[PDB]
Design a protein around this nucleic acid. Sequence first.
RNA 1: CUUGGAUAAGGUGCCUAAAUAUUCGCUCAUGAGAUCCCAUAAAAGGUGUUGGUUCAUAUGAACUAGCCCUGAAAAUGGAUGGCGCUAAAGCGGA
Lengths: 148, 201, 186, 180, 105
Amino acid sequence: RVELTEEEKLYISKKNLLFKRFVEPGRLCLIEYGPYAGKLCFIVDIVTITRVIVDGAFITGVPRMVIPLKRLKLLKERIKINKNCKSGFLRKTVNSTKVLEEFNNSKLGKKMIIKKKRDEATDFERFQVYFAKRELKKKMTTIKNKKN
Amino acid sequence: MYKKEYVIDCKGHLLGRLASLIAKELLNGQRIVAVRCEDINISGSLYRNKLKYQEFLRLRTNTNPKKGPLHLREPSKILWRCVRGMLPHKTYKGQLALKKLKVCVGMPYPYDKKKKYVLPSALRAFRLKKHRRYCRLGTLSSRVGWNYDTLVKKNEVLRKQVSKAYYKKKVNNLNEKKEIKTEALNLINPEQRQVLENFGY
Amino acid sequence: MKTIVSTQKVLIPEGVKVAINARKVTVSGKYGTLRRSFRHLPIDIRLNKLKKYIKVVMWFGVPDSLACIRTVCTHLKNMFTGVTKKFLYKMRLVHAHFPINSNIVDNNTRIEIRNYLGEKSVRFVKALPGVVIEKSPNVKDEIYVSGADIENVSLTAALIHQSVLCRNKDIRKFLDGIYVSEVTTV
Amino acid sequence: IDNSLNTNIHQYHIVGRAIPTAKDKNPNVYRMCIFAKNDTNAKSRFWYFMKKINKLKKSNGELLACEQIKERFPLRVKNYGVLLRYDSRTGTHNMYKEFRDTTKEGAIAQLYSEMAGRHRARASSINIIRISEISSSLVRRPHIKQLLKRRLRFPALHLPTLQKEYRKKFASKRPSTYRM
Amino acid sequence: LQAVRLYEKGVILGYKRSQRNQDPNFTLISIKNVNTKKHAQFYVGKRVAYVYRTTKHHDGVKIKCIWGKVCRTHGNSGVIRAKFKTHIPPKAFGDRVRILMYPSN
RNA sequence: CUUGGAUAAGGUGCCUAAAUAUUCGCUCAUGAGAUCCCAUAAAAGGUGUUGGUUCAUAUGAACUAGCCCUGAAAAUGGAUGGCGCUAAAGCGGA
Ligand SMILES: [Mg+2]
Ligand SMILES: [Mg+2]
Ligand SMILES: [Mg+2]
Ligand SMILES: [Mg+2]
Ligand SMILES: [Mg+2]
Ligand SMILES: [Mg+2]
């Protein structure tokens, strides 16, 4: 062969296609409808146009099961997994790749975690937040007054 | 439905689905104001819907047409009539429900400075497959003698210009307030800052 | 049945500038600029400027929908040919006893037709935007209609032809009129 | 575990014979494999076919077994081919179809739905012959060939499906169907 | 900044009915943030107050109340069936009620 | 004669109590369709679209039956009960 120069190279990395996030072994798939709602998983196999086999290794609370594709939301992350993997190899791969923990750093993961934190607050904690905001208001209003 | 008033702009909504969701709200008791009624959509070809209006036009009281069906043809009065046919408007309660609806073409003053809501359960983009045919209510009503389609468009141009200037000023204000916020975080006792950071405020 | 993928590839000629953003196409060349929109059929199309080849791809589709790919490809080829070498339609006007007289006015627009079957009246047609009407320099009874857009030039050529249709006689015997005789390029 | 996704079709294995007599004191024994909703229906179909094909009526016969076969690899994907016979409004025909699933009764569930959707054929007018498994080099229908390429990818173009509590009626910004 | 709230807002729909018959022993209520059957079960023992105004004075005051209870749900969407000590009049079918939180658990 | 519970027939877009529920197919109508009695439609046709059978080296045929269409003309202005409905609120299933 003759290989590709840098010119062609970045040029490949500049074509932003309309469609990203394909269905394939490795996509991340937040789940949206049904009893396992609000949980993560992975595609491991596709049966038909509408039916898919889905598996979240023993890290997440979802077992290996068939699911209608329309209940899913594809995410940005993909793991590069093998031909016909089982759950055990998938756990090792997701552990050694650190993909779940860098979904946690994205825009959607941060807000999901913050909402969770806000849901188990206690009455004293709610008062503490209210008090802190009341304190911050005074500094806002003195700085604003000094400005004009 | 626990508010003094909801303002909807009807641009891009299907006529029947929107009319069915307004009527139940009115029956439960809620003032509703609907604007931009000329942008409502219907789910057939334009010719096919014009045929239906033509059929509606040829039924009248034979002995005296002053009575009988009155053929209203402004795009907002049409939504008014379609809503009226989903209510029991011949009882006192169902006549009270009908009087709580206000419809406009374009966007007059009191409401050009309010907040507008949409109903995703009735949006054309989410309900109608892309190879089907549809028409626009303003075009259909102009084809049967309404005569004001051009004037409202000319008015909407100016309304959008004024809104653009407002939006510019607002974005400047939010930036100028965010900088003040980020400066004032360092003047607070560490406990309040830590509790604010833990809950992401 | 739904097919998964389907594609077709269209080369780009030498002296052409192309642009596509949201299924909206603009092309430019020596003889002007052409615009066209395709936002009525589900496609995502891909333009490679370093090389040639716009490409058209459609995901899950049925035979009814899959038939529109070649249509768009042929339209793109047509407007590439248009900007570099203009389209040309040749026409011949024919008579048995009364000769037909034509006259071109208003900067080579707006032909005027006189003496059709001896009528003493006058008939007018007006060219579509971007079309020019002029008479052949070579032969006796020929018209040239031309320029940059197959749709408009063919529609002008058909509008001239519909203007001298013959009323209630036997049209197998009364054969006067103006007819399209050659389609080519400039 | 999610009952909103279950079909109610299972497979059964039934064995039966005729009551011995003096003219016949060691009669023939028969077996079938039937798909039904429960064991009682499977026995009903077994006796229906015993009467139609052989000369057995339930009243002078006895039943020997009812097993309810289970499936061995319920998470591997197989190919299936089915042979049919059904009645139209003006005659009777027989057909061959192909499905992709992880269980035989999963494929039979699809078959009943398709025969109702495409031909308005009721379950009372369908006889099922010979479900089996077929290798991937001997598949005939084009809509199954599409699914067995080397590197299968495609985008997800469906509209969102959301829980009932997040399915709110007054939105504050009109949503998007793009979702990349 | 005064007069704390301590209840959730509600709206009184009509009676428990079918098409063409009435049965005024029970009444239907909508609760503001509740729109599933499973979230309506949370409130299934609380006391309900309906407060309205009059024009004459009755015991020195011009406000009176009718008391009720939350009894069960009404199916898939968060409506509830309530029972009151007297029957609610029909001239109230869009008015406001208080779903209190007294019998606390 | 009553209080409370849970159903049948039938229904769950609004009129109207309860799903704009879930899961598979089919259908576009310049006079679509919408379930006992029940409130009309045929012979004969279709290069509309979807499945199936049988022949001939990847093309050419011949049949078969689901939805749609032609065949389809009356007298006051009118009737799937009305509005309306085409990612159905239509037809066959779960
Ligand atoms: Mg004549
Ligand atoms: Mg009772
Ligand atoms: Mg209701
Ligand atoms: Mg032949
Ligand atoms: Mg009815
Ligand atoms: Mg209904």
